[PDB]
Ligand SMILES: Nc1ncnc2c1ncn2[C@@H]1O[C@H](COP(=O)(O)OP(=O)(O)O)[C@@H](O)[C@H]1O
């Protein structure tokens with residue numbers, strides 16, 4: 001068996017930093033993991049690969065002819081801890097649907113046997129500002145059973161978490177896609193942990209971990225590494241290890257209860273975020 | 277004549293706060309303005325209307341039968357300074373293309389004579405995390421000649437500005453859509469103004485204004501107002517007046533020069549943003 005997980009959230013919230021660091025911690029533990037990049041920014045694997053980024057399936061298929069002229073062993077690349085990495089890519093801005101490459105990539109990986117029995121986890125790193133096209137495909141087509149949403153005390157980040165939750169509810173009549181938890185990626189604001197716990201409770205889930213804001217992240221990423229690899233003794237490395245442990249142990253996977261805009265604003269006022 | 281402008285940028289960067297405050301300043305000056313909300317969040321007019329939000333064309337058309345059973349005078353609403361306001365709306369998450377309501381809304385407004393000769397400005401407030409579907413329509417279909425991109429020293433916000441610029445370039449062979457400037461909506465980071473000026477120069481545009489981070493924004497918005505209306509004497513009100521004046525006076529409208537990821541990272545290192 002293997003656990004198929006997706007990390008969603010608004011742009012810039014910390015999906016790729018959190019995913020790569022979480023996965024490095026899982027690999028450090030002895031788990032076998034694949035990361036599938038599902039964001040057109042296409043830098044979701046660079047910290048595992050020590051790289052600028054990774055060439056995408058869409059780019060590689062165009063240079064080869066068709067996606068069928070690609071070989072899996074040419075596409076997947078392994079980095080830190082043996083973690084396997086692939087990027088979907090997507091059309092250029094203004095050209096066609098931004099999510100179209102996700103559909104091509106996931107179907108290619110399934111057809112070509114990338115989901116080998118020895119994997120313990122797959123993580124999709126998915127753009128979450130809109131829930132449509134290929135970005136909704138991991139939910140609509142039952143590819144990721146465990147959705148973890150990275151968010152913060154920012155109103156926009158909580159709105160995104162609510163919208164992703166609505167997408168999960170919409171497709172709950174078939175498949176088994178569920179909300180697994182919220183990950184608070186801190187902005188250093190007062191009562192932010194309490195706020196995201198409260199939001200998680202309203203949605204029916206949990207806040208699986210509070211990730212502190214720590215400049216060691218920037219220092220590791222300048223050097224194209226996870227914190228786990230850059231400084232295994234760092235306080236922040238232990239934070240990612242705690243998140244990984246709780247993901248491994250998590251058994252709460254729910255059909256969430258999306259909330260109203262009024263409820264979101266009440267949360268913000270209650271925990272004095274707008275009044276800090 | 278009337279100047280058709282669109283405000284683009286990544287989610288949560290400050291599009292709606294900046295647009296409504298800029299437009300309130302224009303109205304305070306004696307200009308006649310319409311705001312067209314092109315973001316599914318659909319709260320792009322609430323500070324002009326003193327409201328929770330505004331019911332959307334998609335919602336109103338569903339309750340009426342077809343969009344053709346709607347009347348313009350039933351749809352457009354006027355608030356502070358006589359500013360006219362409309363929201364496009366969009367399908368729910370997981371259901372169809374998130375941008376589809378923008379196409380319906382803009383076509384309805386054109387057909388029904390909303391672009392009356394007495395308007396001085398129209399501002400579209402457009403989601404910019406993806407440049408496709410209805411979100412690309414103002415560029416692809418020549419609806420907004422002047423694009424202003426709200427951004428910050430955040431890497432993701434600058435990447436979004438670059439992606440929007442690529443969309444402008446893609447459609448430059450017809451129509452007259454141009455990049456008018458970058459608006460820096462500050463994160464209180466050192467050298468942020470210098471960074472966005474440098475990015476603007478690389479793209480071929482200008483940084484039209486540096487908007488400071490100021491808590492008066494939160495206090496005004498809790499009360500459903502622009503800063504212009506909430507406290508006309510506030511320092512931040514004068515900041516929005518300066519931005520409005522420079523928009524009125526701006527004559528630089530370019531086909532931009534998108535940059536590489538390497539150039540973006542160099543900008544970040546040069547101005548010590550990641551090392552603050
Ligand atoms: N916990 C953290 N502490 C400090 N910086 C962070 C943290 N998480 C993310 N960042 C920084 O935030 C920026 C955006 O994160 P990223 O994971 O790329 O966002 P996304 O993938 O959601 O667009 C990156 O520069 C990253 O280094």
Ligand SMILES: Nc1ncnc2c1ncn2[C@@H]1O[C@H](COP(=O)(O)OP(=O)(O)O)[C@@H](O)[C@H]1O
Nearest residue numbers: 287288289290291292293294488489490493497
């Ligand atoms: N200059 C500013 N100073 C302080 N807070 C701001 C400023 N600009 C925006 N904000 C706050 O940032 C949040 C997001 O802004 P908004 O305009 O809604 O973003 P967008 O429309 O781009 O998603 C809002 O809570 C807003 O009040």
Ligand SMILES: [Mg+2]
Nearest residue numbers: 015016039044
């Ligand atoms: Mg990312």
Ligand SMILES: [Mg+2]
Nearest residue numbers: 291292315320
């Ligand atoms: Mg907005």
